[PDB]
Amino acid sequence: VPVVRSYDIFSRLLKDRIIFLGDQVNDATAGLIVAQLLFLEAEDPDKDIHLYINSPGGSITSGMAIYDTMQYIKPDVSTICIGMAASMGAFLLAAGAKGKRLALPNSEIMIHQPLGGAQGQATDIEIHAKRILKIKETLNEILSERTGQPLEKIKMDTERDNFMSALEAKEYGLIDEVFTKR
């Protein structure tokens, strides 16, 4: 990792209120994101946050920790998609402050329904099946309110993997802008 009185390259950009989610969503990365989000709020509760997203998704609970923290903190959290934002990556992309959700022209967006599993007694399988169904309905209702789409349309569009271009994600309502240059 490159260094820059001697920061590292990712902490030097943290001074410019830039955070990177360029990895899978899990308890380790989401812990760093939350810690960076909380810290940047304590530094300045009104200056915007710039969260670059290049993530294929991951753990739903880890992602909801990022989501709720983004809404919990005072600063607007602008989200920029580079490369790919899929599943919980795309969800956190659509969760940025409305009007400041960007994506570069060749970035890949993908939304789908939750993934999970359950093995054991039939009773425990039902308990976990109902849990992931509530999570699916919760995420759909949040996606609908953040894109403007009707709830039933989000349902049909997330049953299977749904790949979109940056322009298609803008018209759909997942992002607000598609910039090639500044």
Question: Which residues have a catalytic role annotated?
Answer: 87, 112
Q: What residue type is 15 in one-letter code?
A: K
Q: Which of these, 100, 101, 98, 39, lies nearest to 73 by C-alpha position?
A: 39
Pairwise CA distance, residues 68 & 8, whole Å: 28
Nearest Cα to 58, choosing from 66, 50, 48, 46?
A: 66
CA Rg, the chain, in Å?
17
Secondary structure E strands in the chain: 18-21, 49-55, 77-86, 101-103, 108-111, 162-164, 177-178
